Amino acid sequence: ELQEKLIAVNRVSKTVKGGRIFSFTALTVVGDGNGRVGFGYGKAREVPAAIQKAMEKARRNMINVALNNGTLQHPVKGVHTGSRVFMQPASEGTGIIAGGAMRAVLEVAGVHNVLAKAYGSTNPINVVRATIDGLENMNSPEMVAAKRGK
RNA sequence: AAUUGAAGAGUUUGAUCAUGGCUCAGAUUGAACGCUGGCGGCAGGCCUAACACAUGCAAGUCGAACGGUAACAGGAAGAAG
């Protein structure tokens, strides 16, 4: 019931004294399938150590999302660095139809059938960060009615 | 009951993030070309030279408008084997 999946692995470099030194970065997202989404970055010298650090950071640093029946509630826009992201609840608008690196976080998030369209930059490290910010500041009808009295 | 509706990716760098262009994945067509080709249904078929046109048809009808008889088939009368 953990439901982990990796989005992006890259080879970064460092350029020391004698030549270059190549390191690998993972970027994974875990989530239970009912709210509870996390992402982790993690970087290491080989690929399986990188993904393992990424999963291990992603299992902690996990955020609650106030889902609807199987989906979002109201249309929400989350931004991070250069990466602007729209989402629309699509009240059984079948299938998760999101961009790459947004399909994954929305998939393990437990949502099933939203409509997305990322704008701006679509770097995978910042398009999540713009989905969680997004799903984090999406509030439910029992939270809005809690705030404003009824 | 009559709008249930939105996906990205590759490429600037030793690597990064951003900006930014180029390019790809889709659908479409009065299409052409290449390879191949069994049947049917429904549609479509000179986008260019509003260039030049052989030949055949594409606008005739009415005698219940009229003088009339060129034919065709009868009618009447005459003459002949």
Side-chain angles (χ1 to χ4, degrees):
Chain A
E1 63 184 337
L2 55 89
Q3 181 62 256
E4 66 186 1
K5 73 185 290 157
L6 83 102
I7 286 90
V9 60
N10 294 319
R11 195 176 75 182
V12 292
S13 166
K14 197 185 156 327
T15 317
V16 299
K17 182 67 134 77
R20 310 174 167 92
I21 196 63
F22 294 99
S23 171
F24 288 93
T25 64
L27 175 67
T28 68
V29 178
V30 315
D32 60 354
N34 187 5
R36 293 294 303 284
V37 198
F39 76 104
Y41 191 60
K43 61 176 300 196
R45 187 169 287 280
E46 297 165 23
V47 185
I51 63 100
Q52 194 155 316
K53 289 177 185 178
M55 292 302 182
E56 191 167 354
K57 291 183 171 283
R59 292 171 188 285
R60 69 174 68 83
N61 309 115
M62 189 183 296
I63 199 172
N64 279 312
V65 177
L67 269 76
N68 208 350
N69 196 357
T71 180
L72 263 60
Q73 280 169 345
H74 60 89
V76 72
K77 310 200 306 288
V79 304
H80 196 74
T81 293
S83 183
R84 310 156 65 200
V85 161
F86 184 72
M87 284 170 226
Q88 192 168 11
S91 182
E92 218 286 313
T94 287
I96 182 76
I97 50 179
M102 185 168 176
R103 174 174 293 285
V105 51
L106 257 31
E107 182 167 13
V108 303
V111 321
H112 288 93
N113 40 15
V114 320
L115 306 161
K117 202 52 183 166
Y119 298 105
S121 181
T122 178
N123 195 21
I125 302 99
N126 290 321
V127 75
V128 50
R129 305 285 189 126
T131 293
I132 278 100
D133 299 332
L135 306 174
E136 174 174 358
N137 64 357
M138 177 183 76
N139 50 0
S140 66
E142 60 217 46
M143 294 299 184
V144 301
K147 291 195 277 304
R148 58 212 254 250
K150 57 188 190 295

